[model samples]
Target: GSGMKEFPCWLVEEFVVAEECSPCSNFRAKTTPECGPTGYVEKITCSSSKRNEFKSCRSALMEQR
Candidate 1:
């Protein structure tokens, strides 16, 4: 599980997003769909109008501005 690791949040987020979300905008996401499949996105949460897919177990970043 991705829960309860002693690593810093940035470290965790970096690795998780790199492996899954990969610093992608829609343009990149579309192109890298094989590497970053929407079906395997696990969970998606929306804010404002944009949505981010979750790879990290903690959703703390979702509440950030």
Candidate 2:
């Protein structure tokens, strides 16, 4: 029993299927979003004009640290 770790599932009910370890509400009303909603995301693409480093404009941002 000591090897088992208890989690606070009472605080979370719905699990975002796409991102397993990812919590959905964590991305609410804060900054730009790297992930879209569970449904209705058509396609994702990236294009940079001024620089060479290629990354999603959303992922390019830090975690507000």
Candidate 3:
């Protein structure tokens, strides 16, 4: 139907879980914006100086999905 939209199963699962979308994955996905056009990430974290902002952004984006 026109009202229906399609998405991959894994994509839907991510929304249903509402888990913290892996920042490492996000970073890897945007290679150019991150370290290089073809480089990828190794890790992600909510560290001392970045915890608050990291937590808020992570949860906010997940919940909004």
Candidate 4:
């Protein structure tokens, strides 16, 4: 015999923009791409977390502004 049950669980990944660009950064300077820019791609992980996340990349437009 076997029993099955449903339970609540959470899977999450946190993201944030880097203050500058570096070798360890992610993303490119092609605005055509999603989150495209010459800055670091921000990301975070957790063993157990929520769905809330934030991610942004530096772009030429941002510098002009």
Candidate 5:
């Protein structure tokens, strides 16, 4: 026996950070955002799993320095 089900799923694109070398606690932490040549694409399969995925972001204070 085989069971399979299909539901509504939308294809979407979003920015995904590939790396994060800075710590959140550090005041002089720096990070860069990137997706790909065509950007990151994912499927919206469920509401519970719909969210942006990223590692870490550069601090506002660090940008000034």
Candidate 6:
């Protein structure tokens, strides 16, 4: 699992839009047929220290849905 802890909704909600959505976007984007097979796709998400953060975002979205 991602090292990230779940934050309180009231407090974390403030930054959710700006801080949380990137990971989900990265996960969904890179997994697409167009990008998944390309070597360069890794560069988009894998290169970031925020990779887990992206996973965290995706996790959050899944929970919401």
On lDDT, the leading prediction is: 1
List, residue by residue over 1-65, the lDDT tens digit for candidate 4: 48886332222333333333222323342432324444433333233553322234454444545
lDDT of 3 by residue, 1-65 (tens): 57987433332232222234343355445542323432322223333332221111243434455
TM-scores for all predictions: 0.19, 0.15, 0.20, 0.22, 0.18, 0.15
**Per model, how many backbone clashes are there?**
0, 0, 0, 1, 0, 1
Of candidate 1, the 10-residue stretch with the lowest lDDT total is 7-16
Could you tell me the lDDT of residue 2 within candidate 6?
A: 70
RMSD of each: 13.1, 16.3, 13.6, 10.2, 11.9, 12.3
Candidate 4 stretches greater than 4 Å from native: 1-12, 22-58
In candidate 5, stretches whose alpha carbon ends up further than 4 angstroms from where it belongs are 1-12, 16-49, 61-65
Scored against the true structure, residue 4 in model 6 reaches a CA lDDT of: 82
Name the lDDT value of residue 6 in candidate 6. Answer: 55
> Which residue pairs clash within candidate 6?
23-54
- Model 2 off-target regions past 4 Å? 1-21, 26-30, 37-65
C-alpha lDDT of residue 59 in model 1? 28
Q: Model 6 segments beyond 4 Å from truth?
A: 1-18, 23-28, 31-53, 58-65
- For TM-score, the strongest prediction is 4
Residues 21-40, candidate 1, lDDT per residue (tens digit)?
Answer: 23446664455443353323
Q: For candidate 4, what's the RMSD?
A: 10.2
lDDT, candidates in the order shown: 0.38, 0.27, 0.33, 0.35, 0.33, 0.34
lDDT for predicted candidate 6 compared with the true structure: 0.34
Per-residue alpha-carbon lDDT of model 5 for 1-65, expressed as tens digits? Answer: 48786333222434333333233322222232322221222222333355444333444433445
Worst 10 residues of 3 by lDDT: 48-57
